[PDB]
Amino acid sequence: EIAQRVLEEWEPKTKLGRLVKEGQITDIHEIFRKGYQIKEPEIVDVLLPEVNLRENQEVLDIALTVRMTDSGRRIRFRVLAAVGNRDGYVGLGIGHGREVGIAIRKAINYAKMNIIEIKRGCGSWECRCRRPHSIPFAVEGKEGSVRVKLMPGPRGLGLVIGDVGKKILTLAGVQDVWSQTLGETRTTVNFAKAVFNALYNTNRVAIKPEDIERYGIVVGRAM
Template identity: 45%
Template sequence: MSSMFSSQQQQAEWKPRTTLGRDVLAGKITSMDQIYENGLRIQESEIVKHLLPDIKSQVVHVGIVQKQTDAGEMTRFNALVAVGNEAGWFGIGKGKASQMRLAIDKATNAAYLNVIPVKLGCGSWECKCTQLHSVPFKVRGKGGSVTLEIIPGPRGLGLVAGENIKNLLKLAGLKDSWTKTFGSTNTMSSTTKAVFNALRSTYSVG
């Protein structure tokens, strides 16, 4: 399941609840880079939507959990959502609720709060251009039993990956790369976390 929609469709009138939110709305902070360079913590999803107006969300997975209680069987939904602006910002989040829509909303909100910067570049020895179309060097990430490697690719290669991973990398802003996976990539929760950790290491490693 992968529905994409712009965060602008969800925008309501925002009344910030935190100092950071008020500074963003007042124009004292004008970019996500400022927030990360100063080590500030984002506690409102509206901050991300305001500073990255072109950010999109993608429902990665929705699962049903049925639990037996004294009152009978209770059904709950688990949602996994990824967000990104296709230009160097990416996040993932999970949500649980008794209704699918609420679970997706919770997961989307959590994904905004988990947004990280992704360092884009051209680490391909075959290409050596200056455009931000791939990763600057090989990165690796782990999630559960899944390990993922993202290897720089030359321009025009495209994303050599399974459909789910390809969609996540595109959301982060990658256009060309090879990928290698180890473990059961059918588990979307682990696979998505492996992608997130690999992309996060573009900054922590380099």
């Protein structure tokens, strides 16, 4: 139904859009680990239809910024938004706007275009299951003054982290994690970007064939 509904009224402008409209590329994993540029949010609307439901579109922050022209001062809105399916795909965006609606829509489109793919597993000394309910190993991210360290935890231990990270990890599909932070967490933008980069850096650790079985590692969607 809605698949073709959206596909019909979309006229592509890029080669990736054209391939996704035709049907050469059918799965979401086919666009990622090649140096493709992603300039249309319709690609992601079509391949990941879960990122249009309101349940998957957290608005994280609204800020009121000021510019001086006295002259009189001019008021603007900055919006920070996250989107994602709860099975391995999350993105984050910022939007300028003169009105909050404009800001929000721009932020969500930039979030769709800034989409990544993560890994999941179990690497805690206290569960040793082989199911993907957490992260498989410990990772570190940074932005500005904020430093985030994410550690694997056991089942039933729900997201021991600040709220911004709670939302981002929920959307990425993580259920259990321990955290250490350093710096100024009250800058929501930088706290969020640090968590996002920590999740991205799950793909920069080198592993071996046995680690996959040992930790139940999963790249993207499960099952």
